[PDB]
């Protein structure tokens, strides 16, 4: 969902990317760095907006 011209909860509600984007989207996994045995709930996500 992180690319120009796309939709979805993140693409529509969290952070909109305009069609005319100049740059790079670059991502990798943090399974061993951001996950915990009991669950890491310090990252909060919105699902409803006006």
């Amino acid at each position: 969902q992180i690319a120009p011209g796309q939709t979805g909860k993140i693409a529509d509600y969290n952070y909109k990317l305009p069609d005319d984007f100049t740059g790079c989207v670059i991502a990798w996994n943090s399974n061993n760095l951001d996950s915990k045995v009991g669950g890491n709930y310090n990252y909060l996500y919105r699902l409803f907006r006006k």
Binding site: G5, T7, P18, D19, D20
Partner: protein, 127 residues
Amino acid sequence: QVQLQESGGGLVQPGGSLRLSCAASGFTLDYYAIGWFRQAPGKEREGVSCISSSGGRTNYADSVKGRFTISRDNTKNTVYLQMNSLKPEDTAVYYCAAWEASRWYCPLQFSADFSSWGQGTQVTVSS
């Protein structure tokens, strides 16, 4: 040798997205204001979106607010029109026209003569 050429037309699903291009050859497109115009089957040619020569002023038709985004690249001599949340009401042939402001004021909301025209491209929305 002045030419305006549309590109990017095709067949898309309603709710999908499509992106058109207008390229100019034989002349420098940056000094001209560019507007995207469409005619629906059985309808008259209506103004979809327009952008100023420098790109600092834009106008869109009320049917397409929040759905279409116009912009231009004056280094690459092109003007772009992005279409999102596309609907069956938008099935039409799309022209790009280049002209100069014939009235006082910066905004491009008014219509006027259009000096140069393309041959048009077809975008069909059906599902």
